[PDB]
From Swiss-Prot:
Single GO BP term: neurogenesis
Domain of life: Eukaryota
GO molecular function terms listed in the Swiss-Prot or TrEMBL record: peptide binding
Family listed: Belongs to the olfactory marker protein family.
Compartments (UniProt record): Cytoplasm
Source organism: Rattus norvegicus
GO CC, one annotated term: dendrite
Tissue specificity: Uniquely associated with mature olfactory receptor neurons.
Name of the protein described by the UniProt record: Olfactory marker protein
Pfam families: Olfactory_mark
Protein role: May act as a modulator of the olfactory signal-transduction cascade.
Keywords, comma-separated and alphabetical: Acetylation, Cytoplasm, Olfaction, Sensory transduction
Modified residue annotations for N-acetylalanine: 2
Length: 163
């Protein structure tokens, strides 16, 4: 319950995964209800490399979109790709550099509670957030568990301080 802002309003909303992968994450909620025994929280499914980021639009306009601490059921990192709505993470994933893609990256190691945030790329993505004001209808983005590793179980967390 740490107060990130001057004790004002705090709006922290987690972000969901691609619908297919989310099929394994939300299925997690059911895992705890039926046989949540060996059903680990992560997503033990071999998926290509695409997680969507879906969250209602926090249309506060007083929104302090600041933290994008994203995690995986395993200490590691994941890649964030900012593309247009003509690119679906479900039908596509981290595409080449021909598409507009500012690659921002977050790395969370629990054996090393250190987070490496590549912002120069996320700064360009800062401009992408303004475009959100044009997609103010919802939050949608592309993600990809680094093909070869298992973040196909990325449970993201966003801590913003609402003004």
């Amino acid at each position: 319950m740490a107060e990130d802002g001057p004790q004002k309003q705090q709006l922290d909303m987690p972000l969901v995964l691609d619908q297919d992968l989310t099929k394994q994450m939300r299925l997690r909620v059911e895992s705890l209800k039926q046989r949540g025994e060996k059903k680990q929280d992560g997503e033990k499914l071999l998926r290509p490399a695409e997680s969507v980021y879906r969250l209602d639009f926090i249309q506060q306009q007083k929104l302090q979109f600041d933290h994008w601490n994203v995690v995986l059921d395993k200490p590691g990192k994941v890649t964030i790709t900012g593309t247009s709505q003509n690119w679906t993470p479900d039908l596509t994933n981290l595409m080449t550099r021909q598409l507009l893609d500012p690659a921002a990256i977050f790395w969370r190691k629990e054996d090393s509670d250190a987070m490496d945030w590549n912002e120069a790329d996320a700064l360009e993505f800062g401009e992408r957030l303004s475009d959100l004001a044009k997609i103010r209808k919802v939050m949608y983005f592309l993600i990809t568990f680094g093909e070869g590793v298992e973040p196909a179980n990325l449970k993201a967390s966003v801590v913003f301080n609402q003004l």
